[PDB]
């Protein structure tokens, strides 16, 4: 938590240990109180609004990316989609045929005083 204004991090390695790895992450921050366009991280910090929901958890706990994701709704409509939505509609392709044919049978063929064969 470098107090001053710039930082000059150093890597030292040689013929003995050339294969070495590290990956940094810096963040500018100001002490409280905290004005607008500054997500006030509770870590004695104030970071820029550009760091909000970008994907780096700067004020070490994920405070900016925590409580941040776009989601959806409508659990009845979360399956009207690929294959599972088709097998609803495949059987809906069955049931609707069983409905319209059941319209024609009742209208064309009555119940009262008729012969003992019809139907389709």
């Amino acid at each position: 938590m470098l107090k001053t204004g710039v930082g000059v991090i150093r890597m030292w390695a040689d013929e003995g240990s050339r294969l070495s790895r590290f990956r940094m992450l810096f963040t500018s921050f100001v002490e409280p109180p905290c004005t607008s366009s500054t997500f006030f991280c509770h870590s004695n910090m104030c970071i820029n609004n550009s760091l909000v929901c970008n994907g780096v958890q700067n004020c070490a706990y994920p405070w900016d990316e925590n409580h941040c994701k776009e989601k959806k709704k409508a659990g009845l409509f979360e399956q009207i989609t690929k294959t599972h939505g088709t097998i609803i509609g495949v059987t809906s392709g069955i049931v609707l045929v069983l409905l319209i044919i059941s319209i024609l049978v009742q209208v064309k063929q009555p119940r009262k005083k008729v012969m003992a064969c019809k139907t389709a």
Binding site: H42, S43, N44, A60, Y61, N66, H67, G75, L76, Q79, H84, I88, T91, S92, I94, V95, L98, L99, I101, S102, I103, V105, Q106, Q109, R111, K112, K113, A116, C117, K118, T119, A120
Partner: protein
């Protein structure tokens, strides 16, 4: 509505629209269903069925809510529909009652965390402490096996769970699954000034 998934509720109502219509098709197709309701000297063009499209569709719902009806499946062709649609109902209601008797007892079988010994088990709920206060110094030199095991979490996984300040420690509880450990008076100040919080344990 919860004990059955919302695709089952659509598949049941699609079946009730289905099986009622298929029973309607067979009812004006079957020859051993055309009967004579004639009290007098029979056989003068008074041979009918009972099943309209309205009647066959109030045999579907009438056998789904388990009340029965009057529509009276008489032909062997139609009773097989009645012999299955009844068995379709008797599994759905006996899986609705069985599953709703699982939601109401699992919420009774659970106990809320009320004692830090039971917080020693809950790895899904993370601990907390103020940074190097009296509380943190208590656990790292404790001797009771449950308390050292509570330190065994916070030592190995420090990094996030050992927060800096008490005012900062409240917001971790307020915005996550956190189990912050402060002085017992400051809890009794915070709890009655912020009514959505509590003190579990002793």
């Amino acid at each position: 509505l919860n004990p059955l998934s919302p695709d089952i509720w659509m598949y049941v109502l699609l079946a009730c629209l289905g099986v009622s219509c298929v029973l309607f098709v067979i009812a004006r197709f079957s020859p051993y269903e055309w009967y004579n309701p004639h009290p007098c000297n029979p056989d003068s063009d008074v041979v009918e069925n009972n099943f309209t499209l309205l009647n066959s569709f109030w045999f579907g719902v009438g056998a789904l809510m388990q009340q029965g009806s009057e529509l009276m499946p008489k032909a062997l062709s139609t009773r097989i529909v009645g012999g299955i649609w009844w068995f379709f109902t008797l599994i759905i209601i006996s899986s609705y009652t069985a599953n709703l008797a699982a939601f109401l007892t699992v919420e009774r079988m659970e106990s809320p965390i009320d004692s830090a010994d039971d917080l020693a088990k809950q790895t899904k709920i993370e601990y907390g402490a103020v940074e190097d206060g009296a509380t943190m110094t208590f656990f790292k030199k404790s001797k009771i096996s449950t308390y050292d095991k509570m330190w065994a979490f916070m030592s190995s996984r420090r990094q996030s769970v050992l927060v800096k300040s008490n005012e900062e420690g409240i917001q971790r509880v307020l915005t996550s699954d956190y189990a912050f450990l402060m002085e017992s008076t400051t809890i009794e100040f915070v709890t009655q000034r912020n009514c959505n919080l509590t003190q579990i344990g002793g």
